[PDB]
């Protein structure tokens, strides 16, 4: 499994064409804030292909 | 019921208010595989198997 390739499952919003988001920032999935941490709908943005 | 003679419930002619559904901590799995879970309350579809 090569899983050093990974692309944004979740972001709040599309880019603009040629913008490039590097920020490694929890997401909320859910009504509950997550303040950083990772927890029930709170999921990290970047997932890696297996 | 069993999971052998799963009970099928047929949700149609009504309006569906997916939020509170999605909203309630009570849920340890939400997984959705051909929609998204912020889009159910804009969607509409002709019935639903439950």
Do not use: H, M
């Not at chain 1, 490039?20 to 997401?27: C, H, L, N, V």
């Not at chain 1, 859910?30 to 941490?37: A, D, L, Y």
């Amino acid at each position: 499994g090569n899983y050093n390739y990974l692309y944004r499952l979740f972001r709040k919003s599309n880019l603009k064409p040629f913008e490039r988001d590097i920020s490694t920032e929890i997401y909320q999935a859910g009504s509950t804030p997550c303040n950083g941490v990772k927890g029930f709908n709170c999921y990290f943005p970047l997932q890696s292909y297996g | 019921a069993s999971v052998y003679a799963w009970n099928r419930k047929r949700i149609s002619n009504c309006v569906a208010d997916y939020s509170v559904l999605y909203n309630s901590a009570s849920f340890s799995t939400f997984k959705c595989y051909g929609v998204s879970p912020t889009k159910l309350n804009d969607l509409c579809f002709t019935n639903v198997y439950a």
